[PDB]
Amino acid sequence: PHSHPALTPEQKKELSDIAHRIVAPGKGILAANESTGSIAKRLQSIGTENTEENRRFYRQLLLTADDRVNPCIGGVILFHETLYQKADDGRPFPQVIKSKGGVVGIKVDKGVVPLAGTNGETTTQGLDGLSERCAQYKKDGADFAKWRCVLKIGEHTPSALAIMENANVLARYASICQQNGIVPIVEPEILPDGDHDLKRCQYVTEKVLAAVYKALSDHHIYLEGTLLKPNMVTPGHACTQKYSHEEIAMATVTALRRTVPPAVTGVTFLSGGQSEEEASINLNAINKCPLLKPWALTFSYGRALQASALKAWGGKKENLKAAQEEYVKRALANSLACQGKYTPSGQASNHAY
Amino acid sequence: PHSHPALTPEQKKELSDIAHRIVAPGKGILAANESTGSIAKRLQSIGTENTEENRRFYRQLLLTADDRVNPCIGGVILFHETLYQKADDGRPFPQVIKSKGGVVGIKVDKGVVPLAGTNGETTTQGLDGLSERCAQYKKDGADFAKWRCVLKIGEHTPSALAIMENANVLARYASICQQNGIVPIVEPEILPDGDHDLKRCQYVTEKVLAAVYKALSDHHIYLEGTLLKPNMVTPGHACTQKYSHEEIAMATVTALRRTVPPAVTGVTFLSGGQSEEEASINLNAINKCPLLKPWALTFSYGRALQASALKAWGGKKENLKAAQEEYVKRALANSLACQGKYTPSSNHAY
Amino acid sequence: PHSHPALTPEQKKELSDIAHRIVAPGKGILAANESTGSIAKRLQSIGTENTEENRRFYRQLLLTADDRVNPCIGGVILFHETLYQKADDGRPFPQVIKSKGGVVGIKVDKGVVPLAGTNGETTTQGLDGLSERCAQYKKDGADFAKWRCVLKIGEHTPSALAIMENANVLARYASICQQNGIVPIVEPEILPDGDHDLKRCQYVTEKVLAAVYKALSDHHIYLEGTLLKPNMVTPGHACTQKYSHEEIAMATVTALRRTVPPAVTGVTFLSGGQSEEEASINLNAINKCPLLKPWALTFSYGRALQASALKAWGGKKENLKAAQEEYVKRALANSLACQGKYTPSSNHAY
Amino acid sequence: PHSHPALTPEQKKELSDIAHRIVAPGKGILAANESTGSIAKRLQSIGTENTEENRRFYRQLLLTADDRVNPCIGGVILFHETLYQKADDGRPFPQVIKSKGGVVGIKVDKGVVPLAGTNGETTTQGLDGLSERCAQYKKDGADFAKWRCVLKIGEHTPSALAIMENANVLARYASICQQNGIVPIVEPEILPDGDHDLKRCQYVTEKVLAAVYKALSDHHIYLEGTLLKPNMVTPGHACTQKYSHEEIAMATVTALRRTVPPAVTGVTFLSGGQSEEEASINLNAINKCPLLKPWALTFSYGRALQASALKAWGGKKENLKAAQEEYVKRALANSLACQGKYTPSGQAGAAASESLFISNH
């Protein structure tokens, strides 16, 4: 019943300003933090050798896209390796990102691990020495972090243990980040795998987020200095029933309205397995949903922003411009979507839930 | 992790519709649910015998004020006795209230009881046979309910047990209410008693509300079909440090923004020990706070709306008009206050 | 993190002394607390009109059985009505029970109520005015109480909500009882309904008891002054796999060993749908289980002690002795069973 | 509410058998897992330089004492460094320990870290890559692990957060250990720091242990395959009120009976700041307590077993025998104490009576 301030007014202000810059009107996040293992399949999909130089060239391709992306990108999440690489001119990537008006992010979790006694459920590791890592990343240009927890909808999942443990670890991660001036992006991803319908996803999302915020409260987390990266509420990939984008938007916004405190500065949606176009249309619909939304509703896309770019590149230097153009096009589309101004042309119920 | 719908789309619509009507723009709640015992001291202060007829007459006085209060009153909470009394014209009080555009509320808790092993802390009882009682109250004109839990700020309070137990019983009460088409007003009151400061009240308020909403979620409560009746965030009644109304407003709005989901239809503040003017000025400041507020911020006042009317009445039938005039004055003041239009004449620090 | 003693040493001594007397070696509990409605079906099976007189005569029949039951019965649970009835000779039933060396118990819950948003799950009510009732019951002869919570094993049950709510209400009931010198019997019954196997019942039983004791701890319950009335760990009634009494015993004892603190004075098993003989054989096997058991393992039987007696009675006053004889035989059987001396004629796998 | 077995009957049997061997009748644990930064302060008190060889030699001295300690020591906790060191005869320490009938343990936590928003409270880290580490340690001779969480009694502590977080991490640690055939020793230490009295320590200990076992249940921990290492229930080191050993024993056993399920194989008490003699006397009183105790009640002492030996050694290789003799004497004393058969009356050097309490810095 007694307070022992985790943060000073100055620390809070710093975290809040960082959080607001990332999700400023019209801006979203480019998630380019794929590890060697992740980008391996992507490079192979286009027959490109997975070397540090190729990864640098690819990341540089995205990071150095023309100024059209400036008002679209509020933040860029990088993998450890990328945070210390440089563009051809010798400029550290963090400097490139900042010069274009973006905030630099860094992935800090150490992957998922199995939870014994559950049906294939997991939690996420990475707290050991996290404080020291955060202080170092802050000094090296990062202002926000990424940590991914994964839950699955199944016959007996997410279980009480999985929900409780993932919510608790996310709170510890958020607490350590804030102690070091790093805005933590809380990511409790509920996989779309399965044949469950829309209302089941909405139900599970509602229960998971309620546990998440109770945990953040218990750990004295400063919500204004945080962002939320949840799955959109959608039917399972194998669901026989079909839904409109309007219904997906209503279920998503309704779930958030019932669980996310208005103090949370912004919600940056993960696209899961949605196509580039699908992720933009859904985000736009979410923003057009006729319900009050007290937080920014934008994006934090990876493949949903890189798919076409990667394909257009093909690992050939001569395709640089064509590749950057595909990326810029998705950045512009999502910039409009997070404002509810998206249209395929380019620029120009409720109680049942 | 499986859904077993507690409510149908129809039941949700009914509850949401009721909740919205109570807190519609410029409207608040008149809490006239004092029991014979809780009003005894009020009547003796004006040398008036605490009889059923005098209590009926006083309630009639408030309920039958002129149409000027209609746009100010979205709801009126009644005590069991009053729900079954009639005005001089034979009209049941619930009918009187509805005819003036107000929704009828009913107090359903059975008071606080001590929590063993705590330093004078309590929980609230009243769940036994509550479902049957709600079904009957609904048939008799009531559309929402009142249940008060009490928490205190002290050296070791509120304890983990008190917070957890009160949050849980409020969820049980809310669940039963919604099954019967009654909108539950969740009231986790943190008393202003003590010399603690504004920051302490804000901290405790934030912890209590987080616990309350987690409990509501665990019990599958439909938030759009509920209202919240919390204490404003203020320094202790005996706090030596003084604050401005703007500071109280910032502390209050910040606390709510960090704990109350946007889906909650409205917040109807209890006035505690605040004077009539004080309650109106603070509510006005709250609505003028430069932070985004996704829910209606209004009032659910008892003494803060009746103080002057009770004195003006004085137990004399000849002072009917005079007494009602004082009530109307406060209803108007608070109607403007919940819109940030009342004039008596660094948020990172929170 | 500060202590505010819920009980004084004297209050603790009284509760511990009562708890120990009820489960003294060779002693168990006769659960004769059926309500007018819960006994109707049984009186019907023997074509006997459900009247207060027949109910009184039947209870008298059991309570006045000969002295052979004295060393077998440590406690007798009565329904409210019976606590205030008298034998033909004018002796109040509580007095009849005490004169035979038994402690009088009283049912205090007010039945189960549905938990909205769940798949047919429930919680139990009866907390309202419970303190006053316990004080009255204590004054009128009762020293312990009964409160039954019900959980069910199913595809999605018992849910997190049901477990949490039932454990919490059991703790509230326990706290109130102890404040009035009444030993609370904590009864978290998991129904045997379903086709689930033995290991599934054991798993659910372990999770439920773990939740129960955490809640008792949160509510500051004095364990030495309490008893536990759990279901034995058995396969569902519709389970097609067969098990020996030794496996049922090992599963039961293992589950208790993993969740029930040594401080708990005793475990008084409910028999569910088990026959008189089945319940005795299982209790015997439980007491002969090789593992170490730090608490008395006895019985709190209703049907398991009354089945043959009720049938022998058939509502015929002339059958009095024949009926009592059947009850005495089961009392003797279970007294031997709770000592592992009853005979009708790898733990790592758990 | 559905079971998804974390362990097989074979895995359960292996864990249960290990836990029972460690706390077999008359046996206790030698906590010689002090780190370099910790042992340095110890070697400094005897002018001995804190080198790897000196640390190696000191551990060898303890691990190679005569066979009289064999029936006294059921387990020996080592620090990573020591697990890979060898005695002068080339034998790896794990082999030396096992050859004397002891089970080898390994410290796996990575120390405490501050909990933001609390009054100087902490939680403990070390879960990252713990599974792989346990699998490796198991192959290298270890059968049980050590992980220490720390709580403090104060006006506002331990807080709800500290209690819940520490109990949760202990459960994660225990879960990972059991998946790798390692018996986890759950250690929720409540510091003796402060002026609180006996009943306050009992209250706090009861609340903390209840939280610990609820967490272990939530994480599906196999209790028979675990051990508990708690603080004995005692008044704060600065408490004015005095208590007898019988009162300390009653408070300790009562707290345990109200929270520790019978399935727990054994309780290996930490000595806190108690002197060698006090630790033995209290442990003895605990085992003589009239109440029913369904678990082994023994020791897991570090300094409480080494105090006199360290002083007798003085870093002089010529005092080897004299040093080992002091250790053997304390091991025999605690072996009798964990059976309730200890009665001092005799020698007991002045060093065995000196308080070993160190304020939490």
* Residue among C261, C293, C346 minimizing CB distance to D259: C261
Residue C40: count other Cβ atoms within 10 Å of its Cβ: 12
Buried b (16+ CB within 10 A) or exposed e, A142-172: bbbbbbbbbbbbbebbbbbbbbbbbbbbbbb
* Residue among B153, B263, B293 minimizing CB distance to A257: B263
A258 is in an annotated binding site: no
CA–CA separation, A293 vs A340, rounded Å? Answer: 12
Nearest to A173 by CA among A191, A153, A149: A149
| CB distance A182 to A138 below 8 Å | yes
Find the angle CA(B115)-CA(B211)-CA(B7) to the nearest 5 degrees. 105
Strand partners, D148: D187
Inter-chain CB pairs, A–D, below 8 Å: 78
CATH number of the domain at A1-353, out of 1.10.3720.10, 3.10.20.90, 3.20.20.80, 3.20.20.70? 3.20.20.70
- What's the per-residue H, E or C state across chain B? CCCCCCCCHHHHHHHHHHHHHHCCCCCEEEEECCCHHHHHHHHHCCCCCCCHHHHHHHHHHHHCCCHHHCCCEEEEEECHHHHCCECCCCCEHHHHHHHCCCEEEEECCCCEEECCCCCCCEEECCCCCHHHHHHHHHHCCCCEEEEEEEECCCCCCCCHHHHHHHHHHHHHHHHHHHHCCCEEEEEEEECCCCCCCHHHHHHHHHHHHHHHHHHHHHCCCCHHHCEECCCCCCCCCCCCCCCCHHHHHHHHHHHHHCCCCCCCCEEEECCCCCCHHHHHHHHHHHHHCCCCCCCEEEEEECHHHHHHHHHHHCCCHHHHHHHHHHHHHHHHHHHHHCCCCCCCCCHHHC
What's the Cα-to-Cα distance from D287 to each of A338, B111, D69, D252, D330, rounded to whole Å?
68, 49, 20, 10, 17
Determine the 3-state secondary structure of A62 from DSSP: helix
Side-chain half-sphere exposure of D158, counting CA atoms within 13 A: 31
| Straight-line distance from the first to the last Cα atom of chain B, in angstroms, rounded to the nearest whole number | 36
> What region does A257 belong to: left with phi over 0, alpha with psi -120 to 50, or beta?
alpha
Find the angle CA(D112)-CA(D116)-CA(D117) to the nearest 5 degrees. 135
| Straight-line distance from the first to the last Cα atom of chain D, in angstroms, rounded to the nearest whole number | 44
* Assigned token pair, B24: 């519609």
Burial-class residue B98 by CB neighbours within 10 Å (0-12, 13-18, 19+): middle
- Comparing alpha-carbon positions, the chain D residue that sits nearest to A175 is D116
- Comparing alpha-carbon positions, the chain A residue that sits nearest to B158 is A1
CA–CA separation, A116 vs B260, rounded Å? Answer: 35
Give the mutation candidate from D156, D175, D217 for the A interface (greatest A CB count, under 10 A).
Answer: D175
Instruction: Chain B: give the shortest CA distance to residue A218, in Å.
Output: 8
CA–CA separation, B19 vs A309, rounded Å? Answer: 50
Buried b (16+ CB within 10 A) or exposed e, B310-338: bebbebeeebbeebbbbbbebbbbbbbbb
CA–CA separation, B47 vs C15, rounded Å? Answer: 50
| CB distance C203 to C158 below 8 Å | no
- Comparing alpha-carbon positions, the chain A residue that sits nearest to D220 is A117
Pairing of strands C103-107, A73-78: unpaired
C131 is in an annotated binding site: no
Concatenated DSSP letters of D190-236: E---SS--HHHHHHHHHHHHHHHHHHHHHTT--GGG-EE--B-----
**Which among A34, A121, A165, A187 is annotated as catalytic?**
A187
CA–CA separation, B240 vs B198, rounded Å? Answer: 11
CA–CA separation, B105 vs B30, rounded Å? Answer: 10
Residue recorded with tokens 């619930």: B94
Q: Do D116 and A156 touch (CB under 8 A)?
A: no
| CB distance D199 to D252 below 8 Å | no
The one-letter amino acid code at C116 reads A
| CB distance A299 to A338 below 8 Å | yes
CA–CA separation, B114 vs C123, rounded Å? Answer: 22
Residue recorded with tokens 């990172």: B348
Nearest to A208 by CA among A266, A165, A253: A165
CA–CA separation, D140 vs C19, rounded Å? Answer: 51
Instruction: Chain D: give the shortest CA distance to residue A230, in Å.
Output: 24
Helices (H), D32-119: 36-44, 52-63, 80-83, 93-99
Residue recorded with tokens 């580490």: D133
| CB distance D224 to D262 below 8 Å | no
Nearest to B281 by CA among B325, B344, B236: B344
**Which among A100, A229, A276, A326 is annotated as catalytic?**
A229
- What's the per-residue H, E or C state across chain C? CCCCCCCCHHHHHHHHHHHHHHCCCCCEEEEECCCHHHHHHHHHHCCCCCCHHHHHHHHHHHHCCCHHHCCCEEEEEECHHHHCCECCCCCEHHHHHHHCCCEEEEECCCCEEECCCCCCCEEECCCCCHHHHHHHHHHCCCCEEEEEEEEECCCCCCCHHHHHHHHHHHHHHHHHHHHCCCEEEEEEEEECCCCCCHHHHHHHHHHHHHHHHHHHHHCCCCHHHCEECCCCCCCCCCCCCCCCHHHHHHHHHHHHHCCCCCCCCEEEECCCCCCHHHHHHHHHHHHHCCCCCCCEEEEEECHHHHHHHHHHHCCCHHHHHHHHHHHHHHHHHHHHHCCCCCCCCCHHHC
CA–CA separation, B174 vs B184, rounded Å? Answer: 5
* Assigned token pair, C157: 């049950």
Which 152-211 residues of chain C touch chain D by CB within 8 A? 153, 156-159, 163, 199-200, 203-204, 206-207, 210-211
| CB distance A282 to A232 below 8 Å | yes
| CB distance C202 to C163 below 8 Å | no
Strand partners, D127: none
Q: Do C128 and B123 touch (CB under 8 A)?
A: no
Nearest to C131 by CA among D120, A128, D231, B111: B111
Residue D5, chain A, CB below 8 Å: the answer is yes
| CB distance B57 to B102 below 8 Å | no
| CB distance B195 to B152 below 8 Å | no
Q: Do D161 and A220 touch (CB under 8 A)?
A: yes
* Assigned token pair, A275: 């196509």
* Assigned token pair, B53: 């007829």
CA–CA separation, B261 vs A196, rounded Å? Answer: 26
Nearest to B288 by CA among B348, B338, B235, B333: B338
| CB distance B265 to A292 below 8 Å | no
Contacts of C126 in chain B (CB under 8 A): 128
Which distant-in-sequence residues (6+ apart) come within 8 Å of B228 by Cβ? B185, B186, B187, B209, B260, B264, B266, B267, B268, B295
A314 is in an annotated binding site: no
Which distant-in-sequence residues (6+ apart) come within 8 Å of A263 by Cβ? A223, A224, B254, B257, B258
Chains in touch with A (3+ beta-carbon pairs under 8 Å) read B, D
Looking at residue D138, what DSSP letter applies? H
* Residue among C3, C156, C211 minimizing CB distance to D199: C3
Determine the 3-state secondary structure of D260 from DSSP: coil
| CB distance B232 to B248 below 8 Å | yes
| CB distance D125 to A127 below 8 Å | yes
Burial-class residue C301 by CB neighbours within 10 Å (0-12, 13-18, 19+): buried
Examine the residue annotation and report whether A229 is marked as an active-site residue of this protein: yes
Determine the 3-state secondary structure of D120 from DSSP: coil
CA–CA separation, C267 vs C297, rounded Å? Answer: 5
| CB distance A177 to A184 below 8 Å | yes
Instruction: Chain B: give the shortest CA distance to residue C275, in Å.
Output: 34
Burial-class residue D231 by CB neighbours within 10 Å (0-12, 13-18, 19+): buried
A200 is in an annotated binding site: no
Given in angstroms, what resolution was this structure solved at?
1.9
| CB distance B287 to B301 below 8 Å | no
CA–CA separation, A338 vs A329, rounded Å? Answer: 15
Nearest to D330 by CA among D342, D316, D315: D342
Q: Do D4 and A117 touch (CB under 8 A)?
A: yes
Nearest to D208 by CA among D231, D177, D236: D231
**How many angstroms from the chain centroid is the CA of residue C270?**
5
Instruction: Chain D: give the shortest CA distance to residue A244, in Å.
Output: 34
Contacts of B123 in chain C (CB under 8 A): 172
Q: Do A125 and D129 touch (CB under 8 A)?
A: yes
Q: Do B125 and C128 touch (CB under 8 A)?
A: yes
What's the Cα-to-Cα distance from B229 to each of A351, B150, B194, B267, rounded to whole Å?
24, 12, 21, 6
Residue recorded with tokens 């209202």: B227
The one-letter amino acid code at B150 reads V
Residue recorded with tokens 């004397």: D100
Residue recorded with tokens 């249309």: A281
Q: Do B259 and A163 touch (CB under 8 A)?
A: no
* Assigned token pair, A104: 């630099």
CATH number of the domain at C1-350, out of 3.40.50.300, 3.20.20.70, 3.40.50.920, 3.40.50.11740? 3.20.20.70
Which distant-in-sequence residues (6+ apart) come within 8 Å of A52 by Cβ? A81, A85
CA–CA separation, B259 vs A218, rounded Å? Answer: 12
Contacts of A172 in chain D (CB under 8 A): 123, 165
Pairing of strands A122-124, A112-114: antiparallel
C68 is in an annotated binding site: no
The one-letter amino acid code at D283 reads L
Pairing of strands D266-269, D296-301: parallel
| CB distance C192 to C230 below 8 Å | no
Residue D97: count other Cβ atoms within 10 Å of its Cβ: 25
| CB distance C183 to C143 below 8 Å | yes
Nearest to A239 by CA among A289, A193, A275: A193
Residue A11, chain D, CB below 8 Å: the answer is no
CA–CA separation, A209 vs A317, rounded Å? Answer: 44
CA–CA separation, B57 vs B48, rounded Å? Answer: 12
Nearest to B328 by CA among B59, B96, B68, B87: B68
Instruction: Chain C: give the shortest CA distance to residue D304, in Å.
Output: 29
**Which among B14, B34, B121, B187 is annotated as catalytic?**
B187
Nearest to C1 by CA among D172, D119, B209: D119
Buried b (16+ CB within 10 A) or exposed e, C240-273: eeeeebebbbbbbbbbbbbbbbbbbbbbbbbbbe
CA–CA separation, C150 vs C191, rounded Å? Answer: 7
CA–CA separation, C122 vs A184, rounded Å? Answer: 40
Report how this structure was experimentally obtained.
Answer: X-ray
Cis peptide, bond prior to residue C158, ω within 30 of zero:
yes
Contacts of C6 in chain B (CB under 8 A): 116-117
- The kind and range of the H/E element at D149 are strand D144-151
Looking at residue D92, what DSSP letter applies? B
Find the angle CA(C156)-CA(B171)-CA(A210) to the nearest 5 degrees. 65
CA–CA separation, D9 vs D7, rounded Å? Answer: 7
Nearest to D168 by CA among D113, D222, D111, D127: D127
- Comparing alpha-carbon positions, the chain A residue that sits nearest to D7 is A117
CA–CA separation, D326 vs D329, rounded Å? Answer: 5
Instruction: Chain A: give the shortest CA distance to residue D40, in Å.
Output: 23
CA–CA separation, A24 vs A70, rounded Å? Answer: 12
Side-chain half-sphere exposure of D340, counting CA atoms within 13 A: 11
Looking at residue D258, what DSSP letter applies? T
Q: Do C3 and D203 touch (CB under 8 A)?
A: yes
| CB distance A130 to A169 below 8 Å | no
A273 is in an annotated binding site: yes
- Comparing alpha-carbon positions, the chain D residue that sits nearest to C196 is D2
* Assigned token pair, D201: 């320590």
Task: Specify the fold of D1-361.
Answer: TIM Barrel (3.20.20)
> What are the boundaries of each domain within chain C?
1-350
Contacts of B349 in chain A (CB under 8 A): 9
CA–CA separation, D122 vs D193, rounded Å? Answer: 15
The 3-state DSSP composition of chain A as helix, strand, coil percent (nearest 5) reads 45, 15, 40
Q: Of how many residues is chain D composed?
A: 361
Nearest to A83 by CA among A151, A32, A149, A148: A32
